[PDB]
């Protein structure tokens with residue numbers, strides 16, 4: 001059905017009314033989202049059906065119709081934008097300078113922005129409009145604020 | 157059963173709301189894809 005490049009809402013009618021569980025990126029005929037959003041379950045695009053192709057619970061990522069296509073990376077210096085798609089609200093770009101998640105396996109960028117759970121999977125963009133990761137998997141610090149990682153998959 | 161609805165183009169918008177800090181945090185990623193604060 002709808003294979004157009006762009007950002008999409010992931011919705012369900014299982015709960016009350018229509019509830020938004022997450023967000024995703026459609027690019028090069030592939031739908032990219034966070035694993036915890038869909039749990040690897042199939043998706044519907046009109047009468048079209050999207051089946052999972054690749055997924056990893058540790059990375060918290062999943063691609064539909066084909067392999068992971070996003071590969072741009074945060075340069076560690078520049079400001080980025082979170083293209084946030086909140087439940088029931090219009091897509092909105094928020095510019096921020098990312099922080100750092102120091103792990104034993106290397107440093108990853110971090111975005112300290114607060115959005116409801118249904119915003120999980122919103123893309124993070126560089127100054128060219130290339131998706132450098134997905135927002136929606138992170139931690140909660142001392143002041144109750146949420147810090148998400150900049151999650152990027154590996155392109156083959 | 158889940159479904160997708162388009163929400164917009166993927167573009168950088170000049171002059172957008174600039175907010176949020178840049179913290180440097182020590183974190184740990186478990187086998188279940190869960191991050192946690194290391195102190």
Ligand SMILES: CC(C)CNC(=O)[C@H](Nc1ccc2c(c1)CNC2)c1cc(Cl)cc2[nH]ncc12
Nearest residue numbers: 036060115116117120136137138139188189190
């Ligand atoms: C806040 C921490 C403790 C949870 N981390 C999140 O990123 C969370 N989603 C989530 C849920 C289950 C799993 C994972 C991630 C990874 N694999 C299991 C989330 C994301 C946003 Cl954007 C808002 C949220 N509100 N509450 C939760 C929440």
